[PDB]
Amino acid sequence: AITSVDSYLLSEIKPRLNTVLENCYIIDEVLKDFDYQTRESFKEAFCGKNAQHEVTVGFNFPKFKNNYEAHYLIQLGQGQETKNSLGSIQSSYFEATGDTLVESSTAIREDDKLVFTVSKPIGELIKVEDIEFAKYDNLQVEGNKVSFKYQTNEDYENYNANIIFTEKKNDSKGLVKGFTVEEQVTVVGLSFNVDVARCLDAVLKMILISMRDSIEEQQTFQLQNLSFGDIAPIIEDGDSMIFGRPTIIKYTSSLDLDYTITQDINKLTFKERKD
Amino acid sequence: FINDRGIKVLWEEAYFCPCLNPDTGHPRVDCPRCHGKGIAYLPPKETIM
Numbered sequence: 558a559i560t561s562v563d564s565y566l567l568s569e570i571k572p573r574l575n576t577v578l579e580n581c582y583i584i585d586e587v588l589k590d591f592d593y594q595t596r597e598s599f600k601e602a603f604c605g606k607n608a609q610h611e612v613t614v615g616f617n618f619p620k621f622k623n624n625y626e627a628h629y630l631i632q633l634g635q636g637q638e639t640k641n642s643l644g645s646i647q648s649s650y651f652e653a654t655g656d657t658l659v660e661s662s663t664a665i666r667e668d669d670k671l672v673f674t675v676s677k678p679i680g681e682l683i684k685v686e687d688i689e690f691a692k693y694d695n696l697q698v699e700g701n702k703v704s705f706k707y708q709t710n711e712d713y714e715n716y717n718a719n720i721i722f723t724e725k726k727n728d729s730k731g732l733v734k735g736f737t738v739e740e741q742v743t744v745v746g747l748s749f750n751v752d753v754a755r756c757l758d759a760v761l762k763m764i765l766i767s768m769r770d771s772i773e774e775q776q777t778f779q780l781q782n783l784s785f786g787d788i789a790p791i792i793e794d795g796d797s798m799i800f801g802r803p804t805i806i807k808y809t810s811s812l813d814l815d816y817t818i819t820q821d822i823n824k825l826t827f828k829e830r831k832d
Numbered sequence: 833f834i835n836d837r838g839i840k841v842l843w844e845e846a847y848f849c850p851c852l853n854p855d856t857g858h859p860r861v862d863c864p865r866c867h868g869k870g871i872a873y874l875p876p877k878e879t880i881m
């Protein structure tokens with residue numbers, strides 16, 4: 558599973574940043590240490606549902622003009638290989654598996670079992686929220702749905718559960734070959750007003766903190782490290798300077814490829830010899 | 833000569849807005865006088881340049 562850190566960063570940042578800027582309480586919590594003036598100015602400009610001004614995020618070298626009132630700029634940076642396993646072997650799988658999904662699913666009644674439906678089939682069930690099925694419940698997964706004994710659990714006929722599971726792709730089996738890569742990605746906020754840049758950097762730090770609970774980087778992009786540069790004038794040739802403070806984010810991910818195996822043994826030929 | 837070769841243009845003088853933060857020394861993001869820029873402007877004066 559080749560990793561595109563930049564796209565993941567963008568997808569995590571955009572909705573999360575919009576949600577954070579949606580409400581004032583979270584912003585006030587974030588900007589507790591800042592002075593009244595800059596805090597209130599940033600809140601007036603960008604914060605709130607009905608904010609007239611808006612921030613943006615995008616990759617570097619855009620052929621079009623880019624808004625320099627407040628923008629998050631991303632560039633890919635360097636990368637390095639840090640650790641390897643014997644034969645480049647990372648893991649072995651019997652059934653092809655895709656991404657790990659989290660889905661909410663209300664309990665349902667079936668003639669012998671309570672069940673939960675899901676969007677897609679199941680390759681493996683990791684966890685059901687606040688449940689530890691015993692032998693009596695006889696937890697079974699049958700494609701799309703997971704099921705447990707009806708009678709002794711009948712109080713929970715409409716349990717508002719949620720599920721963490723894994724997609725199923727194929728029944729084939731193979732080996733995972735790959736290594737670990739230690740990658741650096743640079744993120745910088747741009748603004749002709751330095752105070753806006755400072756507040757933007759603080760918001761960036763908070764959303765990076767919040768991201769650590771995300772499933773994907775919990776499973777794929779562990780060992781997050783941060784590093785901040787100095788406030789510098791990005792450009793001097795305009796009528797007014799652009800000010801930005803670059804930040805460097807580090808991640809560790811496992812670049813890997815699935816090598817299928819067609820060998821399947823189903824018969825044995827134990828015979829003696831004579832001389 | 834200047835009135836002949838020039839073009840009609842509006843001249844508006846510049847002055848620092850009072851909205852500047854007294855401690856950081858940098859301006860408010862939005863105010864009527866200056867739209868984030870730290871410098872406000874006076875009423876325009878019609879001029880040939």
Ligand SMILES: [Zn+2]
Nearest residue numbers: 849851863866
């Ligand atoms: Zn002003």
